[PDB]
Amino acid sequence: LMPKHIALIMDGNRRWAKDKGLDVSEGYKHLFPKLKEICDISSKLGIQVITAFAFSTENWKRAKGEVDFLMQMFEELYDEFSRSGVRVSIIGCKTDLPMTLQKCIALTEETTKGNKGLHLVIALNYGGYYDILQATKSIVNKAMNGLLDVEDINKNLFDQELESKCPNPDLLIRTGGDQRVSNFLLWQLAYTEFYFTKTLFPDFGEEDLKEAIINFQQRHR
Amino acid sequence: MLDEALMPKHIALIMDGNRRWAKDKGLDVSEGYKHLFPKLKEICDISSKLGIQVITAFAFSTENWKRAKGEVDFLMQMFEELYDEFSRSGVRVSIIGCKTDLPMTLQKCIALTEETTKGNKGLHLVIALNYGGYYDILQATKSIVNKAMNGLLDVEDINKNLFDQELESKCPNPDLLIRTGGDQRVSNFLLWQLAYTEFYFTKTLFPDFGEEDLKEAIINFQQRHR
Ligand SMILES: CC(C)=CCSP(=O)(O)OP(=O)(O)O
Ligand SMILES: CC(C)=CCSP(=O)(O)OP(=O)(O)O
Ligand SMILES: CC(C)CCOP(=O)(O)OP(=O)(O)O
Ligand SMILES: CC(C)CCOP(=O)(O)OP(=O)(O)O
Ligand SMILES: [Mg+2]
Numbered sequence: 218l219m220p221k222h223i224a225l226i227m228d229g230n231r232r233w234a235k236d237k238g239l240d241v242s243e244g245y246k247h248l249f250p251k252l253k254e255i256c257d258i259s260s261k262l263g264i265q266v267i268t269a270f271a272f273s274t275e276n277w278k279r280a281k282g283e284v285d286f287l288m289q290m291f292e293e294l295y296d297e298f299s300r301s302g303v304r305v306s307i308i309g310c311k312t313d314l315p316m317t318l319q320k321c322i323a324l325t326e327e328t329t330k331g332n333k334g335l336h337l338v339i340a341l342n343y344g345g346y347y348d349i350l351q352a353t354k355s356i357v358n359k360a361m362n363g364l365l366d367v368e369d370i371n372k373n374l375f376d377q378e379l380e381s382k383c384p385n386p387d388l389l390i391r392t393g394g395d396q397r398v399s400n401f402l403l404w405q406l407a408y409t410e411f412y413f414t415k416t417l418f419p420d421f422g423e424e425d426l427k428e429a430i431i432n433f434q435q436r437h438r
Numbered sequence: 439m440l441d442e443a444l445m446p447k448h449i450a451l452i453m454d455g456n457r458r459w460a461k462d463k464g465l466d467v468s469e470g471y472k473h474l475f476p477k478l479k480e481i482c483d484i485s486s487k488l489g490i491q492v493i494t495a496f497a498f499s500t501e502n503w504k505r506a507k508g509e510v511d512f513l514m515q516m517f518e519e520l521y522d523e524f525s526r527s528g529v530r531v532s533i534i535g536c537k538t539d540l541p542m543t544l545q546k547c548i549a550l551t552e553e554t555t556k557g558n559k560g561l562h563l564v565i566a567l568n569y570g571g572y573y574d575i576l577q578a579t580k581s582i583v584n585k586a587m588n589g590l591l592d593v594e595d596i597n598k599n600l601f602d603q604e605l606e607s608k609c610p611n612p613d614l615l616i617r618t619g620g621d622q623r624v625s626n627f628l629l630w631q632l633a634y635t636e637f638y639f640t641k642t643l644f645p646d647f648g649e650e651d652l653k654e655a656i657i658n659f660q661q662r663h664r
C-alpha cells in the first residue's frame with residue numbers, strides 16, 4: 218500500500234535550464250509550483266508527509282548571483298502555500314537566512330498550522346550533519362545541568378532532539394540522476410527505500426510519481 | 439576505461455542476498471552464509487590489485503539479533519572463522535560495532551585477528567559486526583557527553599570534525615557503496631559516513647559477486663564523479 222512519508226531530493230533544476238538554453242533562474246522558478254503540484258497529487262493518493270530538500274548547508278558555496286536569486290525566490294513560499302491546505306514546516310538553520318525570508322517562513326508556518334491535510338516539511342539551509350550536531354549539543358547541554366544521564370542516551374532520545382521527526386521516510390525519491398543523499402536526512406533514512414531517476418525535477422510529473430510508488434510497492438522490507 | 443589513477447580509496451559493501459542464494463538452489467540457509475568470508479576475502483584480493491585502500495563490509499547489524507535463534511547462533515559461531523580466513527591473507531583487519539555484546543569466544547577470535555594482522559601494510563578491511571549507524575552515532579554522543587562533563591571538552595568544540603574522530607568508522611569516508619541482492623536501502627549501515635557516498639545497487643547475490651561486477655561498479659562510479 219501507500220508510503221506515508223516521502224522524502225524528496227529536488228535536484229536537476231539548473232541542468233534542466235542550461236540544457237534547454239534558458240537562464241538558470243528559469244529552472245529555479247519551477248521549484249515551488251512543481252513541489253506544490255506534487256503535494257496535491259500526493260494528498261489525493263493518501264500520502265501524509267513530504268520532506269523536500271530545497272537548499273543544503275553546502276549550497277552557500279554556489280555562485281553569489283544564484284544564491285542571491287534563490288534567497289529572494291524562497292520568499293514566494295507564502296503565496297504558493299498559504300492558501301493551499303498543506304501544512305508547512307521549515308527545517309534547517311533559519312537564523313542564517315535573510316530576515317525578510319525568516320519572517321516569510323514564520324508567517325507561512327503560522328498561517329498553515331491549522332491545516333489538517335498533507336504535511337510538507339521544507340528543508341532550507343539544512344544538512345544531516347547539522348541536524349545530528351544540534352541534537353548532540355542539546356543533549357550535552359542537558360547532561361551538564363543534571364536533566365539527563367549518559368545511560369538515557371538512546372535512539373528514542375535522538376528522535377526527540379532531531380528537527381525531522383518520526384515517523385521517518387518510507388520512500389526517498391531523487392531526481393536528476395545522481396545516486397547519493399548529499400547530506401539530507403542521514404539519521405532518518407536508515408531504513409528508507411531509495412528511488413533514483415534521471416528525470417529532472419521540473420520534468421517530474423504525476424506519472425513519474427506513480428511509477429515511483431509502484432516501484433516502492435514491489436519491494437519487500 | 440577503468441581509470442587506474444582514479445580508484446575509489448574506500449569502498450563500503452553491504453553483503454546481502456546470501457539466504458536467497460541458498461534457497462534459490464534449495465539449499466539450507468547455513469550453506470549461503472558459509473560463502474560470506476571466502477567471497478569477502480576474494481573481493482579484498484581483487485580490490486587490492488586495483489589499488490583500493492579500504493573496504494568496510496557489513497557482516498552483522500544491530501537489528502540482525504531479531505532473526506531466528508538458530509540462524510543467529512550459527513552466524514556467531516561461523517564468524518569465529520575470521521582468523522582462519524584472514525590471519526594469513528596479508529589484509530589488515532579491524533572490526534567495528536559492539537564487541538562486548540558478542541559471545542566471549544568470538545571477542546577473542548576478533549582480538550587475535552586484529553593483533554595478528556595489524557602490521558600488514560596493504561588493504562585495510564573493516565568488518566562491521568554487530569554494528570549499526572544509530573549505534574555509531576549514539577556511542578560517539580555518549581563519549582562526547584562523558585568528556586563534556588569531565589572538563590575534557592567544551593560544548594563549543596562540538597562540530598563535524600569532532601564527530602568524525604569519535605565515530606568508529608573513520609575518515610576517509612566511503613567513495614562508493616555496493617549493495618548486493620537488489621534491495622535499495624542502507625539498512626542502518628554507515629549513516630553519518632555515507633552523506634556524500636555514491637550508491638551502486640546490483641541484483642547479483644553476494645555469493646555470485648565477482649571481479650566483473652566490481653569493475654562495473656567502479657567504472658560506473660567514475661562516470662558520475664563530481
Ligand atoms: C535548488 C538547489 C539549491 C539544488 C538542486 S537543483 P541544482 O541547483 O543542484 O541544479 P543541478 O543539480 O546542478 O541541475
Ligand atoms: C551477512 C548477513 C548476516 C546478512 C545479509 S545476507 P541475508 O541473511 O540478509 O540474506 P537475504 O537478504 O535474506 O537473502
Ligand atoms: C536539492 C538539494 C539542495 C540536495 C542536492 O544538493 P546538491 O546538488 O547541491 O549537492 P550535490 O552536489 O552533492 O548533489
Ligand atoms: C548485510 C547486512 C547485515 C544488512 C542487510 O541485511 P539486513 O537484514 O540487516 O537489512 P534488510 O532487512 O534491509 O535486508
Ligand atoms: Mg545538483
Ligand SMILES: [Mg+2]
Pocket residue numbers: 454455
Ligand atoms: Mg537481507
